[PDB]
UniProtKB/Swiss-Prot annotation, chain A:
The keyword Electron transport does not apply. One of its GO terms (biological process) is pentose-phosphate shunt, non-oxidative branch. Belongs to the transketolase family. Catalyzes the transfer of a two-carbon ketol group from a ketose donor to an aldose acceptor, via a covalent intermediate with the cofactor thiamine pyrophosphate. Thus, catalyzes the reversible transfer of a two-carbon ketol group from sedoheptulose-7-phosphate to glyceraldehyde-3-phosphate, producing xylulose-5-phosphate and ribose-5-phosphate. The record marks 25, 260 as: Important for catalytic activity. This is Transketolase 1. The gene is tktA.
Amino acid sequence: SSRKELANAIRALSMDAVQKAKSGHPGAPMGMADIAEVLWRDFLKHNPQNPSWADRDRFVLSNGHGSMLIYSLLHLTGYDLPMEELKNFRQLHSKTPGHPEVGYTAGVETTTGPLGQGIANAVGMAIAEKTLAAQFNRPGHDIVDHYTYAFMGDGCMMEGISHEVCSLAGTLKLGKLIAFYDDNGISIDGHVEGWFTDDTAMRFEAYGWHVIRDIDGHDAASIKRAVEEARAVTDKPSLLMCKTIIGFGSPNKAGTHDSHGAPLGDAEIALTREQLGWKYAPFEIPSEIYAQWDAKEAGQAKESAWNEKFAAYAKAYPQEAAEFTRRMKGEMPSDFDAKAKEFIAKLQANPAKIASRKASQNAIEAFGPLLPEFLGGSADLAPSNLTLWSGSKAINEDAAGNYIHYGVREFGMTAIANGISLHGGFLPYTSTFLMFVEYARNAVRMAALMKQRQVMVYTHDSIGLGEDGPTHQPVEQVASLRVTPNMSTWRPCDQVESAVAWKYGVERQDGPTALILSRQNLAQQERTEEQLANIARGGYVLKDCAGQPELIFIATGSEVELAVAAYEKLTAEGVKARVVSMPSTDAFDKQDAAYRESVLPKAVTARVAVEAGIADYWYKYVGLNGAIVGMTTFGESAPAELLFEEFGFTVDNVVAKAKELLHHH
Amino acid sequence: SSRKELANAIRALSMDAVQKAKSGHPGAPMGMADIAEVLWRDFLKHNPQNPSWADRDRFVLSNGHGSMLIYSLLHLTGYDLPMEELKNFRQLHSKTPGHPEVGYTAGVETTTGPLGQGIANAVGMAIAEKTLAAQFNRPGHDIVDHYTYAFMGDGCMMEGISHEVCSLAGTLKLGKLIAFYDDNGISIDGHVEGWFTDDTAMRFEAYGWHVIRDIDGHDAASIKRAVEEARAVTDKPSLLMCKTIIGFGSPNKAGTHDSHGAPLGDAEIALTREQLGWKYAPFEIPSEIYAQWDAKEAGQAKESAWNEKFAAYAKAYPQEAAEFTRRMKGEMPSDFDAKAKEFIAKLQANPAKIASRKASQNAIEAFGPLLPEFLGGSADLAPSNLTLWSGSKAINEDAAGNYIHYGVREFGMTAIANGISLHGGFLPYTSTFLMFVEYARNAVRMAALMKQRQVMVYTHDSIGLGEDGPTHQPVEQVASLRVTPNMSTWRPCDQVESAVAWKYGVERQDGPTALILSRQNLAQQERTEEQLANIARGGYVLKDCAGQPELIFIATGSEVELAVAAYEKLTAEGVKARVVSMPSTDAFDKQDAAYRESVLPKAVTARVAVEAGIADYWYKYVGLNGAIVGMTTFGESAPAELLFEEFGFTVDNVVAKAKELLHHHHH
Ligand SMILES: [Ca+2]
Ligand SMILES: [Ca+2]
Ligand code: NA
Ligand code: NA
């Protein structure tokens, strides 16, 4: 069959699957089909029989609304994605959800849809390949050698995150990253010129990319030459400017916004079949077309050759090969749990009053030698977030390093780190001031949705940061993280809770962990062995009374000391009081009900939450008959000690709120 | 005095005020002082005695950590910012907070600090000037004519929002926007080349800006020539690449990251005075330096001339002049309240089961003729968010229009709109799918912090959007907005609540209002005149029983219909039930204790919340002895009606959960 006929198989499956679902996006799949045919059939290194092959090329659809493009490619090339799944596009619990989802579907590398994040993920995958190659390859043994290919459209280009990640990709000279821009002139509002006029090629040259202009995206020869040129440029990421017609093949909807995001309609599909010369019924693909698209034979041969290379590497470099396998599988070192517990116990036995941002740095220092998979960084705040340890080595200085200076790029940093975790081989950590989780907020959500392990180190967590004032002082950010599905959030009260939280984060297998860390020094709490072991349960009894409590303080982070001081005053008066430290609400909620009852007995309704964050969160644990010593406003610019007084974080106020509560009970 | 001596007054006040506070950022003020001296003394059109003069130039410090730069300028030029306030830099309730804040300090145009947002605000101010000039200027009467000047640094340049807003500024040919880039080679991690290597000039040329390269930022003549060149280019925004030395004057800390974000230290300040030749003690400025910096006499003359121009305009164009004054003051038309109430009453009397996104469009259509100040837009989703009305006209097509195609730029859109509201003359509305509030999230917060009027139209609010799936289906986003200080969030249940929420938003002068709008059609509920008036109280009794309820449903948005159906089933079985519609938790919380008790009586603990959003929010109103029919997970890609079934938003499940709750209460 001709290359155009092979590409038209994508067009037919895509328009037909959208039509059957009465939902979805036919235009971009039809516009990019010729580019995909060249890339996938002539260049992409992959094995449909093992989508987890460590050295496969990675493909990313940043314009993820065009999901039928990737489903068509996976089906046609022989992945485990049968025609019946394509006939179930956008239907409940199918393998073909409306935007592609990692884990749902063999061969999907990332969950995309939110524009701009796919290219960010691809930058992270390319950083991962470059770093892993530098760490593991040896003379005569290049066991890491693969490309990262991304498709992206006008929406990704307009989004600010594209600027963040493509700027950094240029700095890092990511010569195995090759992006294809679907330059079709159309977005949802219509002809893009009314709102998007960049000289995109000049912009990308300003980032240090190699740019190939004026590619005919409907001409296989033009596309193939451009890909060859990009592969020959080994010291710059490449952008291929592909002129395409959205909805290519449709006489009445090609080149129109109408083709972007709704079914073409039955009559228009019939006219499209006529224009394309496509003679097959919906969901019919002839054997000749499958024979030319199938990648099982070539893919198995390529993976088998790689397996033989890896076997030879393992003979010459046995310890390195074992580390490669462990890291690509995402497994932890067998002795990590014991060694981390030993560190935690040492901290409990050797008290220190330090900021939890410093306790975080100390945990990185302790775990660094044990976790060579760390690939950490900060968004231009290394000396404030405290993300460097003695073994940190910046990858812009040494490609085999373990640290990224991300610059002032919080959203891009977080979505790059999602790509790093998706690649395999690494455990990424990222960092900024907590307020700027808001810049990165959807990438944080995407880490949780994709079940990815990433530790997110958020410092300067409250009015305790002092004079920088209300634009920087978090109030409501932690509450939002706490109600995000599959997110773990820890607000440690001292250096011991900080190390437990770090351990919890690195040991998650199925989602991310945010650490909520103080600028100011935090006193260490004394703990029994039982309390020490129960920190990891997220909430535990820190101070207690004999018998059933009359009054329970629930406190987190920097406010535990205040709650303890109020507890001591009331205990001396003869109140049966308790303090619960709640470093992680999510870990607490996951405990068995007997444990939760032992900490927060259902019969004890006189509960006072204490936290320098938005009060409204705490109704979850105090209900309608408790009290909350929290924030209800933005902060103020002043020294931290005066702010804590101004906003009611005083022993007198906490005691008064508890006594007022005890009248009612 | 020489120009350098005048600039050194900024350096001295800045380093000394940071030192006294033992906190703050001396480096950028010291690095940009010569640029500021030229801009403010030779070009800026302003009147210190009236910071609200409608036709003043607007200045924005996007690198807002350098707050002592603007405080020095405002003090030296004669604004109401006494030296005592500079001595109280970063102290509680001073007029000199660590990052500048609009409202409390005379002459501060915007609250900045979060990097990139200042340049976005400046783009909005420049859009506002261009649009207001096109709407109001007449032959012989150019009553709107002013520049927007912005300072920005490497952090702003690295942030994605700078790409969004500077790209759009290029498309819109904002020839009165002039930005100065503090090109000093330093960020917090050190020398920027390890993480920031863009050819920034080439990047901005790709956006359609006029770029002036290689300006000596410590040479007044070079800076002045560059500003003159940028002012001569009337068809492009301009970027002035100013090579500066951070901490200029400090022998040991100039050019170092150490000068960025901590006091220089007393010993280093002494050496800096010696290098700069600045003899005056901390907080001492001689009368002759004030005489050269003061702008009161020039500012009075400029504003007086403008007032004469405006008086001549008002004689020739009296209705237009009255509209200009009204709009610049942020006042609403005198008949708006009555006309909007008439519209709301008509909707209550004429049911229509339509999506609240469509009810929103209908409110824009009804309000549009009454609010010529609207400057609305969507982030490339006009046909989905339903932000166009019959009178919309895109400003890229006609500069006197009222609509902005923002492109796929949610964060930039929202921070541009903050600039629009800060400028005066307009009432901005912005729009995207609700999920992508997360892209714009800090700009929403900044609107609330700055007490700005902006209506944020967020459509496709739940699993009700269907097949696009979990990356697009909001779950926890509304709860995040609800816990934001000074935010107003409305999730209307029908076309009537939608119109009430729109009226509330446009009339809310002291903060923003988000509308949480459905893709799918919403049943209209029956209301008495009192219930109709009670929508605006945020939470109200929609269905009731005689005597104390044994069950209260609390529902919002698309789930009110489900809660009412469950109420009807239970009522028919003899259960005493009530339904509360809670379109706005923030408005409800602002009602007095007696009203809140009347709606959610403390005696009734069997409360069931119903909302297709994150469940944990609702403990605030249901307590520990209730039930929540909510989401606890991400969504799924499927037809919406199947999602509502799968996630428990069915009458059978709501009734079962309510009966299970009552059974637990009984035993
Ligand atoms: Ca497009
Ligand atoms: Ca800088
Ligand atoms: Na290359
Ligand atoms: Na100009």
